[PDB]
């Protein structure tokens, strides 16, 4: 029953998932002036050379590109992180218009979209167990603005017509997610949560400073997706983002400046 519309949208989530009003909820606004530079934070390590994508899926809330996480292939490590975390999927959140769509904001700025590359802590042996742990997940967030095309995103955009409606999937092999990374790896980092139900407070958030650009035609194709299933009255998949939640005590750290 949860979703993004008037009657089931984020402001309604706490009824089914009371952790919605918890102490480390995401996303947040990144106040770039109150974030603490920390010279002791390590460079992020993104080792994606051996990634193996398998499938793309419309789950009724976004689309996921899934990876085979059964060995140490695509991993995140270093940065603020203690273990190594394995890539399991990526997805995006986007707007009905270019002026909105991102979940994190930067001094109140909303970007057109936000890419989430979701990884899990190897010491918990799988994603299902990792989410019940406070340091179970690491999500690398990357902001999208509209301007020039991202060539590396086009294979994703071209297959979306085949997964139009809730439930649909398609084989999605040899997709290289290094094609979605900006040039710099400068980041902010803070402790928080899944930004969809079940809203578990299990995530180390790593948000890149440098957005990637995508074309208006790329983002327009995200907006032709559907929340509904093939049976049903079309609701376009747009504005599937949660807004910024209270920071409460937490401190946001910066890798830079």
Known binding positions: 91, 93, 116, 195-196
Is residue 189 a contact point for ligand V49 (CB under 6 A)? no
User: CA-to-CA distance for 208 and 183, rounded, in angstroms?
Assistant: 10
Please provide residue 114's backbone torsions phi and psi, each rounded to the nearest 5 degrees: -145, 125
Residues 101-160 that bind Zn ion (CB under 5 A): 116
Is residue 195 a contact point for ligand V49 (CB under 6 A)? yes
Least Å distance, CB 93 to Zn ion, is: 5
Count of helices and strands (H, E) across the chain: 3, 15
* CB nearer Zn ion, residue 53 or residue 193: 193
Q: Residue 160: which residues within 8 A CB-CB, separation 6 or more?
A: 63, 221, 222, 224, 225
Among the listed residues 226, 255, 215, 244, the one whose alpha carbon sits nearest the alpha carbon of residue 78: 255
Is residue 83 a contact point for ligand V49 (CB under 6 A)? no
Q: Is 7 annotated in the active site? A: no
Position of tokens 């999605």?
172
Q: Euclidean distance between the first and final Cα of the chain, in Å?
A: 44
Pick from 116, 150, 166, 209: which binds ligand V49 (CB under 6 A)? 116
Stretch that binds ligand V49, among 105-113, 165-173, 193-201, 206-214 (CB under 6 A): 193-201
**Which tokens go with 152?**
């590396």
Least Å distance, CB 145 to Zn ion, is: 18
Please provide residue 123's backbone torsions phi and psi, each rounded to the nearest 5 degrees: -65, -5
Pick from 9, 78, 147, 198: which binds ligand V49 (CB under 6 A)? 198
Is residue 119 a contact point for ligand V49 (CB under 6 A)? no
* CB nearer ligand V49, residue 1 or residue 257: 1
Where do contacts with Zn ion occur on this chain (CB under 5 A)? 116
């Amino acid at each position: 029953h949860w979703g993004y519309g008037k009657h089931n949208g984020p402001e309604h989530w706490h009824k089914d998932f009371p952790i919605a009003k918890g102490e480390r909820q995401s996303p947040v606004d990144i106040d770039t002036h109150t974030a603490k530079y920390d010279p002791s934070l390590k460079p992020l390590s993104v080792s994606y050379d051996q990634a193996t994508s398998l499938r793309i899926l419309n789950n009724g809330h976004a689309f996921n590109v899934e990876f085979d996480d059964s060995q140490d292939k695509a991993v995140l490590k270093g940065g603020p992180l203690d273990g190594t975390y394995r890539l399991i999927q990526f997805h995006f959140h986007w707007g009905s218009l270019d002026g909105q769509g991102s979940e994190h904001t930067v001094d109140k700025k909303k970007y057109a979209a936000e890419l989430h590359l979701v990884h899990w802590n190897t010491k918990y042996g799988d994603f299902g167990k990792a989410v019940q742990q406070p340091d179970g997940l690491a999500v690398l967030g990357i902001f999208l603005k509209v301007g020039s095309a991202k060539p590396g995103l086009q294979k994703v955009v071209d297959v979306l017509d085949s997964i139009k409606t809730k439930g649909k999937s398609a084989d999605f092999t040899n997709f290289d997610p290094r094609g979605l990374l900006p040039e710099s790896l400068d980041y902010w980092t803070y402790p928080g949560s899944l930004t969809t139900p079940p809203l578990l407070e299990c995530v180390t958030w790593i948000v890149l400073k440098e957005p990637i650009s995508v074309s208006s035609e790329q983002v327009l194709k995200f907006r032709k997706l559907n929340f509904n299933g093939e049976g049903e009255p079309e609701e376009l998949m747009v504005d599937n983002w949660r807004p910024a939640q209270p920071l409460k005590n937490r401190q946001i750290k910066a890798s830079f400046k």
